[PDB]
Design a protein around this nucleic acid. Structure first.
Lengths: 151, 205, 262, 57
RNA sequence: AAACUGCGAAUGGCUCAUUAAAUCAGUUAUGGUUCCUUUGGUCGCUCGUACUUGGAUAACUGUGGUAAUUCUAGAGCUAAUACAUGCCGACGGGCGCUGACCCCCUUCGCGGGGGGGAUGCGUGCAUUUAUCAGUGGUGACUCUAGAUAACCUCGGGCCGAUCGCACGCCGGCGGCGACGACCCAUUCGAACGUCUGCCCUAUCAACUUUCGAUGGUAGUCGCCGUGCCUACCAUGGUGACCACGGGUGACGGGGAAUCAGGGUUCGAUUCCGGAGAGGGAGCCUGAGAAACGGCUACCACAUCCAAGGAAGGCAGCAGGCGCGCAAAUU
RNA sequence: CUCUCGGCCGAAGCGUUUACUUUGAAAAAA
């Protein structure tokens, strides 16, 4: 029901959601407490991480990942998977003989949480290193700034 | 002879790797010993460091937790009703993690009538044998007669549970990995998780 | 390989042991112990190479096997036992006492010390954790764990251990204005006052240090050992006072010190 | 032959010895844990006395 | 002496066939894991025959087989820090559930509130699940501790049936060691990852995806993180910034030759890292090996043989043959 | 370059993000 699209029950595993209540609890409000945590390097947890209903075990604000290592950046190129995007990093490689540089690029598959909704391609995104999330994915999207051709 | 290496795959670009060594021992994998329902049979494995792995092949009991009442009792595993990975694992009655099992509610019924003095799961005809008449109609002291009735107000149960208590079989979900710890523990399904897996089993047929 | 290495080649040894090129293929390969093998001086190098007591690597066996050697007050019958920083070596048959402190050039030194000072040593606190029915512990850089510490001991401070009992007597905390020795890097063996500590969260703290002549330097935080409260060292110091001379005035000291001869 | 599993005066003395090391390990756990119970009192009372100058002002 | 037990034999030595984002180098990460040993901690914290337990087995004696092997069979004895089983003591209790009963205050009384309590149950530290509250910590834990309910594998988890030396103090109380030992920390590592980097080729321009290719969910396996693998889905992932394929007279670095400055070429070779023991493959033991001076197969060679069988692995040091322009002492 | 605190002097924030340059610390021995 807007979450449970799978074949097993999507449940935030730290929160107990079957507490016994009294008559002022059943008549008052059906309140699901949510688990969120603070990534420790000055990234603000979004209000969608504190107010959402999405369930993601590899989200860096609500799931079981810890961000440690290199913090990087890149721009979005292809959002065609389930919860993960493709960013390309651009850099210049110095060739020593010619004393000149050359354009170079590398792609990264990177996990995008559902708290970063309405992300268009072509905007800068900070990524953060965690453990392997799948075969090719080892970074997690941390903040999304928009391209300068927005308003 | 299984090998859970990463170098027998293709690259992300799609190119295949020519390997740079033969299979090392720390890359090993062992066969799935699927835990079935039967009287207990565990076979210990020797894993890295000299440690132990309890590879269970048959299991019959396991302690489960009624979450909303803080009650953990050791029940009898009956059946497998639904498994959300593969459904051939239900006809084979394999106990894996997160598979929904039928347990026996009788240790929780004895806790409920001892803690709240209310008949749970009894029929409407209410044939009440005298050996539990003394725990359902006991003689109470002056301070205990108010304590039990103080417990008796919030001693309500969601009606999806009481239909399972009628037939004596609760729905439970395994939360421990039996092929690695040799136990089949877990919790009793309550509330929204219960009415999710109920309609999954109902739509399964 | 398959499982751990038991040999050390000679050229691959630590540079500060000062083993020459032509004596052998192998170097003494320190035993596992309290210290990293890059951060230690084995007991065979202290007896044969530095002190010139022994002459071969069989006489170190013959010396240590008479139980004549106590490292931190416990008798050591391993010749490759890694003695490290602030370790007290008591030889009672002759009457000397040494402490392993770095000198200004990144090596250890023969630092003879008085047996009134040899009853204690300093350690640096490395991790503090609770556990086992709520009992707090220390872990120092010697792997010495001292349960029930003072609640005002935190990480990166300095305790003072009594060596006959194993217990803490009094401590120094990590602050500015404290006298510190650098125990790693290119400023190793240098003594100065803590000026400043820049924090880099998710990376290493940099601790700017100031000399007694004005020479400022910086290190990472892990190469910092608080020796004194204020400017007074709670241990003795070597012949040089932890103050690194540049090579010009280090030459001037020699070419002016030879002129006292006759 | 040499009789093994014989209750020698040495054999019986060794059982006395390691029982004595049980009492000494229980001796220190009564006395080390008492001093930290004393030391936590000073370091709690001084923090409480620091509280009364920052909450008041 | 022997033999049982323990430990080592996983290092060192040799070679460079593989291998082209692989190895490797610098840089980080394990807050995603194991670690014999060493060093420090801990080891009457558990409320329930011991002044010492049980059965074998070598060496040895004695009788044999086979052409033959570091092949072994049967018979008679005997040990343990091998293999097993197994208490007492601390031990008086305490703490949580229960709870007949008793007592006290107030109320005319009902009633309300507060103490003591026999009875039974469970109690440590590791294990596995669930729930609660928020001593010490980090940049950030689903951390560390605490509480509660239970579990705790017969292919069992700790809680010592062990040896030595000086000898004792008032039948007890002993001092130094040696072996052990679950767990924690450390040391020595290992493994798996992050970022950046490599020679020639387009007469290699599209590749990957039935048979996992990229991702999502649930699990299986594994020391653990992950298509590692399985089920169900989604249709993705890389490509002139040269993917994919082929080649290399390619193990990679530290380095070496030459050189005004720029460069060019070599780096099998004594240090670090990888790999491999004729070619593939599979295991046992162990902290650590997919080990070859370990075992089991198959393919290739090849030794003895009484023709039934038995045993092999020099890219260790010497040495021999072959190869070659080309390289030392059994 | 400035805002809320501690003893005018330190925290915390920056500013649009970089390339460049200078310093630092880390870079096995041979």
């Amino acid at each position: 029901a807007d979450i449970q699209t799978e074949r097993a029950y999507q449940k935030q595993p730290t929160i107990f959601q079957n507490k016994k209540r009294v008559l002022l609890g059943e008549t008052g409000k059906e309140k699901l407490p949510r688990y969120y945590k603070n990534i420790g390097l000055g990234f603000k947890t979004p209000k969608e991480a504190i107010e959402g209903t999405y369930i993601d075990k590899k989200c860096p604000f609500t799931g079981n990942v810890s961000i440690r290592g290199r913090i990087l950046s890149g721009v979005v190129t292809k959002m065609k998977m389930q919860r993960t995007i493709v960013i390309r990093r651009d850099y210049l490689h110095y060739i020593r003989k010619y004393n000149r540089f050359e354009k170079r690029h590398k792609n990264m598959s990177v996990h995008l949480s559902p708290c970063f909704r309405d992300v268009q391609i072509g905007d800068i995104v900070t990524v953060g290193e965690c453990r392997p999330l799948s075969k090719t994915v080892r970074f997690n999207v941390l903040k999304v700034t928009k391209a300068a051709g927005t308003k | 002879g299984i090998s859970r290496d990463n170098w027998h795959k293709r690259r992300k670009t799609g190119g295949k790797r020519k390997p740079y060594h033969k299979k090392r021992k720390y890359e090993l994998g062992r066969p799935a010993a699927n835990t079935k329902i039967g009287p207990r049979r565990i076979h210990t494995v020797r894993v890295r460091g000299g440690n132990k792995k309890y590879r269970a092949l048959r299991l019959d009991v396991g302690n489960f937790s009624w979450g909303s009442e803080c009650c953990t009792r050791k029940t009898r595993i009956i059946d497998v009703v639904y498994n959300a990975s593969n459904n051939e694992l239900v006809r084979t009655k394999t106990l894996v993690k997160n598979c929904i099992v039928l347990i026996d509610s009788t240790p929780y019924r004895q806790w409920y009538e001892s803690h709240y003095a209310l008949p749970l799961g009894r029929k409407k005809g209410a044939k009440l044998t005298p050996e539990e008449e003394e725990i359902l109609n006991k003689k109470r002291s002056k301070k205990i007669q108010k304590k039990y009735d103080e417990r008796k107000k919030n001693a309500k149960i969601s009606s999806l549970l009481e239909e399972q208590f009628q037939q004596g079989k609760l729905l439970a979900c395994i939360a421990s990995r039996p092929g690695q710890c040799g136990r089949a523990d877990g919790y009793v399904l309550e509330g929204k998780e219960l009415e999710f897996y109920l309609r999954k089993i109902k739509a399964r047929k | 390989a398959r499982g751990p290495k038991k040999h050390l080649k000679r050229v691959a040894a630590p540079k500060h042991w000062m083993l020459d090129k032509l004596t052998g293929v192998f170097a003494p390969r320190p035993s596992t112990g309290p210290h990293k093998l890059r951060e230690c001086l084995p007991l065979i190098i202290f007896l044969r190479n530095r002190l010139k007591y022994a002459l071969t690597g069989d006489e170190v066996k013959k010396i240590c096997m008479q139980r004549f050697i106590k490292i931190d007050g416990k008798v050591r019958t391993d010749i490759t036992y890694p003695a490290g920083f602030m370790d007290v070596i008591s030889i009672d048959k002759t009457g000397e006492n040494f402490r392993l402190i770095y000198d200004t050039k990144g090596r250890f030194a023969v630092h003879r010390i008085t047996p009134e000072e040899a009853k204690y040593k300093l350690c640096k606190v490395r991790k503090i954790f609770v556990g086992t029915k709520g009992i707090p512990h220390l872990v120092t850089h010697d792997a010495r764990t001292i349960r029930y510490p003072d609640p005002l001991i935190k990480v990166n401070d300095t305790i003072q251990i009594d060596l006959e009992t194993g217990k803490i007597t009094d401590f120094i905390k990590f602050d500015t204005g404290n006298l510190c020795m650098v125990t790693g890097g290119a400023n190793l063996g240098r003594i100065g006052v803590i000026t400043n500590r820049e924090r880099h969260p998710g990376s290493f703290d940099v601790v700017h240090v100031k000399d007694a002549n004005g020479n400022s330097f910086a290190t990472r935080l892990s190469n910092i050992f608080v020796i004194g409260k204020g400017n007074k060292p709670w241990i003795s110091l070597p012949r040089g006072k932890g103050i690194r001379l540049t090579i010009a005035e280090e030459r001037d000291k020699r070419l002016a010190a030879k002129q006292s001869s006759g | 032959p040499k009789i093994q599993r014989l209750v020698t005066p040495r054999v019986l003395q060794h059982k006395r010895r390691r029982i004595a090391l049980k009492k000494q390990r229980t001796k220190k756990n009564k006395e080390e844990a008492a001093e930290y119970a004393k030391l936590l009192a000073k370091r709690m009372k001084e923090a409480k006395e620091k509280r009364q100058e920052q909450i008041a002002k």
